[PDB]
Symmetry: C4
Subunit: 395 residues, 4 copies
Amino acid sequence: GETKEDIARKEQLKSLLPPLDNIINLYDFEYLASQTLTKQAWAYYSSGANDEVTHRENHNAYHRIFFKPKILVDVRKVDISTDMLGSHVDVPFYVSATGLCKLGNPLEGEKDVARGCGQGVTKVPQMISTAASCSPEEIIEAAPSDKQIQWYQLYVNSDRKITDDLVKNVEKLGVKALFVTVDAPSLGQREKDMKLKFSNGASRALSKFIDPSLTWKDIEELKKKTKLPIVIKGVQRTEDVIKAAEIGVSGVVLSNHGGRQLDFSRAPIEVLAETMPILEQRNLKDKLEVFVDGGVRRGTDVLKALCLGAKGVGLGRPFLYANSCYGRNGVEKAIEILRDEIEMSMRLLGVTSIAELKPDLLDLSTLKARTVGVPNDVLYNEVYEGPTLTEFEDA
Amino acid sequence: GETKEDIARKEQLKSLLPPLDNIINLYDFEYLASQTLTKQAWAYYSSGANDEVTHRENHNAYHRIFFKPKILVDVRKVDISTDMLGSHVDVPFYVSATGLCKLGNPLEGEKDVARGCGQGVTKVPQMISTAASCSPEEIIEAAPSDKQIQWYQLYVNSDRKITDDLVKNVEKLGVKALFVTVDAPSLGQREKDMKLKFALSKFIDPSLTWKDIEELKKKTKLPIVIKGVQRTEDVIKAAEIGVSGVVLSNHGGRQLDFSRAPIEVLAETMPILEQRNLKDKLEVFVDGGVRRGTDVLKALCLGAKGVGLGRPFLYANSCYGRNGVEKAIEILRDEIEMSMRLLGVTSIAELKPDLLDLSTLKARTVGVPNDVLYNEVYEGPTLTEFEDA
Amino acid sequence: GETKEDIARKEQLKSLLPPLDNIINLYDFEYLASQTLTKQAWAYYSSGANDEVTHRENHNAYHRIFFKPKILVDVRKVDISTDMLGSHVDVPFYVSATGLCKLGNPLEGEKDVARGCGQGVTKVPQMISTAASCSPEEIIEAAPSDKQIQWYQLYVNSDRKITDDLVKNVEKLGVKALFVTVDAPSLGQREKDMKLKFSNGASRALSKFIDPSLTWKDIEELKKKTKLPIVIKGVQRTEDVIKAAEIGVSGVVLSNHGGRQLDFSRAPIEVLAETMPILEQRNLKDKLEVFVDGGVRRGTDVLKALCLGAKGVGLGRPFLYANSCYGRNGVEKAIEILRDEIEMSMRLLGVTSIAELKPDLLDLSTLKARTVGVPNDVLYNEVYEGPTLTEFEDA
Amino acid sequence: GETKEDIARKEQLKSLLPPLDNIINLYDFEYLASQTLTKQAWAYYSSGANDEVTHRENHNAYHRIFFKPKILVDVRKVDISTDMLGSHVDVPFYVSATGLCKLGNPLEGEKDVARGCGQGVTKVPQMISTAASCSPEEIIEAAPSDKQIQWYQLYVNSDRKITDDLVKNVEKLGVKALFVTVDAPSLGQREKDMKLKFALSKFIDPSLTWKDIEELKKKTKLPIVIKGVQRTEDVIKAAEIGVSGVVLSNHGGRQLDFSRAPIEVLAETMPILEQRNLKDKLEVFVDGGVRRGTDVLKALCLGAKGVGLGRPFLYANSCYGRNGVEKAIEILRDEIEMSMRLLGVTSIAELKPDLLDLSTLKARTVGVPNDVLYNEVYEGPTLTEFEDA
Ligand SMILES: Cc1cc2nc3c(=O)[nH]c(=O)nc-3n(C[C@H](O)[C@H](O)[C@H](O)COP(=O)(O)O)c2cc1C
Ligand SMILES: Cc1cc2nc3c(=O)[nH]c(=O)nc-3n(C[C@H](O)[C@H](O)[C@H](O)COP(=O)(O)O)c2cc1C
Ligand SMILES: Cc1cc2nc3c(=O)[nH]c(=O)nc-3n(C[C@H](O)[C@H](O)[C@H](O)COP(=O)(O)O)c2cc1C
Ligand SMILES: Cc1cc2nc3c(=O)[nH]c(=O)nc-3n(C[C@H](O)[C@H](O)[C@H](O)COP(=O)(O)O)c2cc1C
């Protein structure tokens, strides 16, 4: 629904976009993108399912957790590197799979995220999406480091030959893990997107591309057909984390697809807080790597998830916005913004490595204070007049 | 008010209404209805009692419930059909009784509800209101399908002769059940209606007792549902005198304000029915504030046999008549199937409490008043801006 | 700080004021008063202490309580009469003591509230204030019924002779109880009022008029010097309700002076909920009458307090606003609005008398959910764009 | 930015500022300061870390505490004096350290804080900032009274020679104690300041350990308070190595975001100190978000020996210099006395936990996101209107 007004945005893009060095936090990329993207690019990237409560709750649940920082600790040197899925990693976060990057970066798309992830002094793992505009071969050869790690996000097709070919193709090209997405058997209804087509059933949200019949048995079979570590992406309850351990897969992403699938799925941060203790109650902790994603925007968020026992934390939208505004250098800047935020807050937390981030650094006593207020009294509040500040004379 | 202004309205409902197929959810219907209906049609439909807290809490309480969905389950095929009141049904929801449809749909009224409820693939039960603009016979025959099911809602009269006639007369016309409304012995004060205009009715007997329901059990073979229960103790009472069902309801927040959300009463009473083997003896329905497939699913996971919707169907009808009603049914049907799949179950019988996170069901909060001064002077963080220009 | 603009309000007063019959609820009187009163009349009536949180919390705490209504009960006849302090009363509410009614009703002041309280088919008890513009003799003789009950609100003076004379004078004139106010040894700082003087220490909030040295011993002494039932007004904790019972006084008003004294005093409705069970845990329930006030605006509020065991519930501001807009008939209308609201809701509750209003009609499980949210994430919420409703075509 | 626009500012601070005696509370000072200060003065004073949640939570958490006041107590006479760090004090609060006062008060800076702190009836302790525009000697002598007490806040340098000099040098000048800041090994990111401009310091040693505090105990006879403790475990640690006190503080929300409100840490640690006989061994101070006499009282009721305020004094100083500072002291002193009387106690020693309702101290909530659609379409009740015109 673009208007030649298309040009109002070209003016904004026109380095009315502020210098990259002036970007303070991940929210800046978001704001800029919101003003410069195509109506449809913005609809597709930013939308969630139905009323979008899970989308927002993903982020807000981090705020039910506070810190218990150690003071008078030697925090001169801080190290934020760790290991994920057998690789050594510079950073405890990763770029999550996201479709259609050419909507925001027409010229380079996902190749610019491979570049941003691997060009600088700090490299970040990249999860390549099945719904990528570019091909896996294009994205992998765009990688500027032999050391940078690239994972593959898989939808199993109803036609399992296509998936068999795809898995073989991507191990050849050297991706280091498979993330099988299990939270989208049906396509989430993203109403901002639809509003735009309509003026601008049910089995229609099914597709041969994403097999709705996918089953625990299929993952067990996939496991035999590849030497790649497999991670189940989109786990939303502890019972399924346990099942994942039982079939001996490598990991799990506690994720609700960025609030794009089931609304009123819980914040993965609280699923995490419940899951990890239960894993340690049966020796399973060090045998399944547990990742988390959704609503992560600050280093303190990353830190909260790590203290609860996540191996790593993924971000989707923030890298899309960075890429959509500044391409490969936007991605790298986003990486630096986040790396620095993690470093800062570790010092202030009083720890010096990722292994030192533990549950007793957190105040978890209000983790369950997820509340819905009684509706307010509109008449009472309407007639009520609040206090006032003294005014200035005005001469 | 109604000021000849109302051609601005007639322009709105003109071809200016968007194509039916552009309607995405039930709130769209509500929005459109709010701009096109008469002040008095709007006030009467949208109204609740006094401060309207129960009205809104009916809905918001669904948001105290979250999902624990199963993944890696074959969900290619899903069935949302179920039984209600001895008869088989396509969906696990229904149209609740809801007076005076002719204010919003003048030519057709609640005849168009009947039409919408059966003119398409999915056939949805209709509760006929005592307060309906059309007569029960006028509605029952406008129904395009004989597969479609119709229920009757009854206020018992102070003159019990009239009620005995009306019961026998609806039995005749083919209604498959009788819903007895018990939450309106006196009609609730709906202040939006009153402000525009500028409590005991003969229609409704305030003396209605349990014994009178025991009476009605013998005088009819239609199954009786007590519509308007608001505490567990009375759900139990309905079982003891052996009626068929019960709607956990507070009349869409139109009667007693600070009545609890039925979803919250549901969550309290089902475990109690279980601890008593009564969960089969009594069918427990629920209405109020239902606007999304996930609302319906929450209710069904808790033990509800079926869930009612009032206002959403009124608004769809007010805007697009029978078609709107059909479309509303479609929207809601799809929302349930899609969310069923993501939940990881394939039949209504598989919707159980273990699919739900009920740990924050009781987080019904009232904040301490905000610090007006502290908030006024405080200046929030700001986004990076865009250059010069 | 009035501007001749004084006349903008005279125009509004000019039966631009809608007919009395068009007043639906107590909030209407409030709104009307807010537009028609003198800046100072509005400041004095409507203000609370400091940040006014207790003032607002008084009302909101009612909303932490829901109902558990009985259905299929014979509710044809409903009776809302009861007894207070030895008198039989038409109604379970009363008009609380309020100063300076001539600010809002220049011609008649408090005499119009005596009239409104006693003229109609439904009479309401009236608590006469020490800070009344009119004299107790004027207010008592304005009473249109021999049956209407009038109480007296007392501040004990530092000069106890004045108080001794006053108590003797008011028993002579036939008031039926003494309410001794104990929550104002120092004057609450009401900043809306002050803003208005300033542009328009500490011992300055002390006054010989209200003795700060008032003590439990003084009430015991007052008790001997009068045959009038004495009620302690301004009790804010259970421990003082127990002390009141111990000295054998007749009652207590759980009250914080309408949020005009200590800020962060609790809502009397929750003090009530805690106090009553503790009274029954030591036989004291039927030996001390417990009144409650502050933030009562609806009949469901009155009902909530009665179910918890209050003998009666007082309203201040709502009668001031009614009197300030419509004088004696405003008061009577307010009385009818509230009587009707109580009657309606009793039917719907499924009870038929005041004695039938009991704790098990209430859902008290969230009574303690008095919460303060973590501050919200202004950046997150700012960039976030919510869902949208479909628009209309616009031709 | 700073755009010659700033004569609009100079007009504001002109006789346009209201008479000092019209200032009612501490927020008035803040408001006035917000309109008159330079963008950079404002950003630097008003700033917090990252999202500024801790900044605001410092204050809002006081609102999770309510009072259980005693009535019928003789409160004619009230005393708010107390001891802090071995010396007797007029009030139970103090001015906390707070860099660069010359941005807001150019001619006088933190000399005017000293003046305000002692130029009138009430004499309030001053913490001198390492980051002060004026030198410690320049401040210590501008103090109009020798009764008034001054403390020093210290960042220990990586070059420990400089710290040894500075300590000996402040001991000399007469500071009655030493506040060691431990919550800023790396300086917090204050984004308002940064947005206007468009993390390890030599000033501050990130390697500071407990052992180093043990070291400083021997090398000085001034009592040491560890300023910037944020968990109970470290309060205990401070007692064990035997320092004098501890400020429960998170640097006014300027360092680690999602550090808890000190008032909430206070409520957790005092009962623990009691269960260990340590409550006398250690003096526990508290700062952050304090704007009202009742905030101060809540803190004192919980066990705090004294409570600090940063920003309110900066803003009073920025607007009215030493006079503002005196007036701020007055406002706060009166607020405490008045609320003491209504609380029903007459000395600081009588402020105890039983005066507090602590039952909702843990009600630190985050609401589920609001239902945007449901709220947009919903229309609230309306007030009766006023006739024609
Ligand atoms: C634009 C968009 C497209 C996405 N496409 C996919 C996809 O194809 N496969 C997948 O497994 N996840 C997909 N995701 C979800 C993520 O990998 C991730 O769960 C989400 O972005 C985490 O949330 P956040 O964006 O709030 O950080 C997508 C997310 C977005 C926002
Ligand atoms: C305009 C209107 C009229 C209604 N009339 C009746 C009635 O006559 N009898 C009855 O039992 N319920 C009546 N109801 C209430 C419902 O049957 C139903 O309980 C309610 O609409 C459920 O709430 P919801 O509108 O939020 O879906 C009415 C509701 C509305 C909105
Ligand atoms: C304008 C005003 C003046 C008052 N004057 C007195 C008084 O002199 N004595 C007293 O005991 N209470 C006095 N009160 C308080 C009440 O009697 C009562 O506690 C309060 O009005 C209850 O709260 P509400 O106004 O929210 O209903 C006054 C209240 C107001 C609003
Ligand atoms: C502008 C500014 C500068 C500050 N500089 C310091 C400092 O150098 N050292 C220190 O220990 N605290 C410093 N503080 C923090 C305080 O001493 C105090 O902990 C804080 O201001 C308490 O919070 P409040 O401002 O909400 O009262 C500073 C605070 C502000 C606002």
